[PDB]
């Protein structure tokens, strides 16, 4: 009887330590995003285009963090909160996740036009931030519908209840196709836009004769690496999971165990984007730093 | 119990049959959100769990025998 | 025996999995337990011809 069930292996050590890490991220993002919102909205003078992008990014990250406490408690003893929240909470989380990433793509395009095309009149197309931010928010809601349509609590025997998807008898294959959206409009498309824009932006800054060119490049490099670090590990694991299910890579009980831990670990790493965003994009500028001090008084 | 962010089939390999006398219970799971194929898992009298092939003619007969 | 008053009807579409436990030291009667999609557990009569149909239907998918 060489064939036997591949019993899942779970360790209590991982689960409760994750809760504190989720809670710590919740506190910082809630405080950090509010300060960014507080600084911009307090004074309405000099509301440049970048101020609008940051304002939406702060809102996108603030809402995303707002759902963390429920998600953290889920990892403890499974989804005990019912089916209705498994849809609403999943909608709010994914809508902001898509919006947050796409804004980082829009911000990069704005910087590309501001620097590379500073002289020409094409840079005048960056005054449509008001509508462009509306488009991104609208597009994100369109890409989160599958989560709302095909999610429910899936009671099982080996595992505690989970807020999984139910697309029919062939849900296993259909779920894999739905993963193309996060891995196409969420990682690859944003990454290519960011690298292209920052790829050429660094070419002009590397040739200009300013004094602040040195700090600008180091900020640009930090932005790119932080994006890759937070999201690349998660997508590579997700791609590995898809390959294993399709039998492209040999499947064994040990491999399924390894990927399960990898997905849990990376997801924690990816969630940190809601915390570093205020520091990387907003609080690294003179205007915001000087602004915060004046508001205190 | 365990907490899984991914649901996977509980069976990898499959046997063509087992001696009925050593079978204590059998679990039949229809296709669902966590698995594309039907899974028949047999819990032996010794505490070991073994897979059974749903398409096997013998497997269908065995379940009928127990339900007697 | 975990199955005391076996039901006489369950919607076939709502059943997720059926567990059959043969006679043993913990129970002198055959038990059939079906786990509904909503997490509830219901006991089916092993002698009911309709119950046999559900198990047969599930296997021949």
UniProtKB/Swiss-Prot annotation, chain A:
Q: Which residues form the signal peptide?
A: none
Source organism, top-level taxon: Eukaryota
Q: Can you cite a GO biological process for this protein?
A: receptor internalization
Q: Where are the transmembrane segments?
A: 16-42, 52-72, 88-109, 131-150, 176-198, 219-240, 262-282
Describe the PTM: Phosphorylated upon ligand binding; which is required for desensitization.
A GO molecular function assigned to this protein is: C-C chemokine receptor activity
All ranges on the Extracellular side of the membrane? 73-87, 151-175, 241-261
Instruction: Describe its function.
Output: Receptor for interleukin-8 which is a powerful neutrophil chemotactic factor. Binding of IL-8 to the receptor causes activation of neutrophils. This response is mediated via a G-protein that activates a phosphatidylinositol-calcium second messenger system. Binds to IL-8 with high affinity. Also binds with high affinity to CXCL3, GRO/MGSA and NAP-2.
Q: What is this protein called?
A: C-X-C chemokine receptor type 2
Which portion of the entire protein is included?
34 to 330 of 360
From Swiss-Prot, chain C:
Taxonomy, superkingdom: Eukaryota
* Disulfide pattern: 1-27, 3-43
Q: What is this protein called?
A: GRO-alpha(6-73)
Q: Which organism is it from?
A: Homo sapiens
Source lineage: Eukaryota, Metazoa, Chordata, Craniata, Vertebrata
Q: Which residues of the full protein are shown?
A: 43 to 103 of 107
């Amino acid at each position: 009887l060489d064939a036997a069930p591949c019993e899942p292996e779970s360790l209590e050590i991982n689960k409760y330590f994750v809760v504190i890490i989720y809670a710590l991220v919740f506190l910082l993002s809630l405080l950090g995003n509010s300060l960014v919102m507080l600084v911009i909205l307090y004074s309405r003078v000099g509301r440049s285009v970048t101020d609008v992008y940051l304002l939406n990014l702060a809102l996108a990250d603030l809402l995303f963090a707002l759902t963390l406490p429920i998600w953290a408690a889920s990892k403890v003893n499974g989804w005990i909160f019912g089916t209705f929240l498994c849809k609403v909470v999943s909608l709010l989380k994914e809508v902001n996740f898509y919006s947050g990433i796409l804004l980082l793509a829009c911000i990069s395009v704005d910087r590309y036009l501001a620097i590379v095309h500073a002289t020409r009149t094409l840079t005048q197309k960056r005054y449509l931030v008001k509508f462009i931010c509306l488009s991104i928010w609208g597009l994100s809601l369109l890409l989160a519908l599958p989560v709302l349509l095909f999610r429910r609590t899936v009671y099982s025997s080996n595992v505690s209840p989970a807020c999984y998807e139910d697309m029919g008898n062939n849900t296993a294959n259909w779920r894999m196709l739905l993963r193309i959206l996060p891995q196409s409009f969420g990682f690859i498309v944003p990454l290519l836009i960011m690298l292209f824009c920052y790829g050429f932006t660094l070419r002009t800054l590397f040739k200009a004769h300013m004094g602040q060119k040195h700090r600008a490049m180091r900020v640009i490099f930090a932005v790119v690496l932080i994006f890759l670090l937070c999201w690349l590990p998660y997508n590579l694991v997700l791609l590995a999971d898809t390959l294993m299910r399709t039998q492209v890579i040999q499947e064994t009980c040990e491999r399924r165990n390894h990927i399960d831990r990898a997905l849990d670990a990376t997801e924690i790493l990816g969630i940190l984007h809601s915390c570093l965003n205020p520091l990387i994009y907003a609080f690294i500028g003179q205007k915001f730093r000087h602004g915060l001090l004046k508001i205190l008084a | 119990a365990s907490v899984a962010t991914e649901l996977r089939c509980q069976c990898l390999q499959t046997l063509q049959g087992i001696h009925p006398k050593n079978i204590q219970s059998v679990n039949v799971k229809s296709p669902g959100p966590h698995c594309a194929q039907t899974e028949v898992i047999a819990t032996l009298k010794n505490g070991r769990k073994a897979c059974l092939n749903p398409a096997s003619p013998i497997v269908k007969k065995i379940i009928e025998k127990m339900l007697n």
